[PDB]
From a paper:
To effectively manage the substantial workload, Pol II features a unique C-terminal domain (CTD) in its largest subunit RPB1. This domain is characterized by a conserved repetitive sequence of seven residues YSPTSPS (repeated 26 times for Saccharomyces cerevisiae and 52 for Homo sapiens) and is crucial for coordinating mRNA production and processing. Central to the CTD’s functionality is its capacity for phosphorylation. Notably, this overlap was particularly pronounced among proteins harboring a CTD binding motif known as the CTD-interacting domain (CID).
To test if proteins containing a CID motif that were previously characterized as pSer2 binders can also bind to pThr4, we started with a structural and biophysical analysis of RPRD1B, a human transcription regulator that contains a CID that strongly interacts with pSer2. We first used fluorescence anisotropy (FA) to measure the interaction of RPRD1B with a 16-nucleotide oligomer CTD polypeptide phosphorylated at a single position either at Ser2 or at Thr4 located in the middle of the heptad. Purified RPRD1B can bind to both pSer2 and pThr4 CTD peptides, with a little tighter association to the pThr4 peptide [dissociation constant (Kd) of 22.8 ± 11 μM for pSer2 and 5.3 ± 2 μM for pThr4]. To investigate the recognition mode of human CID proteins to a pThr4 CTD, we cocrystallized RPRD1B with a 15-nucleotide oligomer, singly phosphorylated Thr4 CTD peptide. We determined the complex structure at 2.5 Å (statistics for data collection and refinement in table S6). The RPRD1B-CID is composed of eight α helices arranged in a right-handed superhelical array, characteristic of the conserved CID fold. Notably, in both structures, the recognition of the phospho-CTD residue depends on Arg106. Arg106 forms salt bridge interactions with the phosphate group when the phosphate group is extended either from Ser2 or Thr4. The only difference in the CTD peptide recognition of RPRD1B for pSer2 or pThr4 CTD peptide is R114, which can potentially form a salt bridge with the phosphate group of the Thr4 phosphate but is located too far (6.9 Å) from the Ser2 phosphate. Our structure of RPRD1B in complex with pThr4 CTD peptides indicates that Arg106 mediates pSer2/pThr4 recognition through salt bridge formation to the phosphorylated CTD residue.
Residue numbers in the entry:
A (entry chain A): 1 to 127
B (entry chain C): 141 to 152
Write the structure that this text describes.
């Protein structure tokens, strides 16, 4: 049963494990009908998380964007109007840290072509 | 502790 305030909770609980990301990402696709609200609160809780978890949020994005595609172009569509902000935001606050994992996520994105060429760019130059 | 998420794990 979808509820915005439950998502905020799951997000708060999201760990870095392969299991945490992969079954939270399943919950979200179950509710692909709620893609717009889901992404908008992800964007809010993302910006609230500490820097060590910001990456993990982008890895949630990944697993839902990629697996939602067998189901429809909802989250794919919802996330683009956001990702140029989320990346550019996480680029900073990686002030005293490493942007190599973000530059790889863009590369496994143009490789699998999850988004399109001009948008993988702007994602690259957002940082 | 479980294995760490890998961005590639999704099926392509």
């Amino acid at each position: 049963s979808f509820s915005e305030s439950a998502l905020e909770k799951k997000l708060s609980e999201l760990s870095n494990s392969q299991h945490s990301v992969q079954t939270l990402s399943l919950w979200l696709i179950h509710h692909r009908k709620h893609a717009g609200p889901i992404v908008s609160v992800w964007h809010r809780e993302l910006r609230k998380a500490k820097s060590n978890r910001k990456l993990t949020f982008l890895y949630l994005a990944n697993d839902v964007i990629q697996n939602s595609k067998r189901k429809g172009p909802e989250f794919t569509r919802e996330f683009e109007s956001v990702l140029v902000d989320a990346f550019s935001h996480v680029a900073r606050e990686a002030d005293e840290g490493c942007k190599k994992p973000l530059e790889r996520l863009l590369n496994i994105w143009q490789e699998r072509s999850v988004y399109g060429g001009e948008f993988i760019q702007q994602l690259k130059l957002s940082m | 502790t479980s294995p760490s998420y890998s961005p590639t794990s999704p099926s392509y």
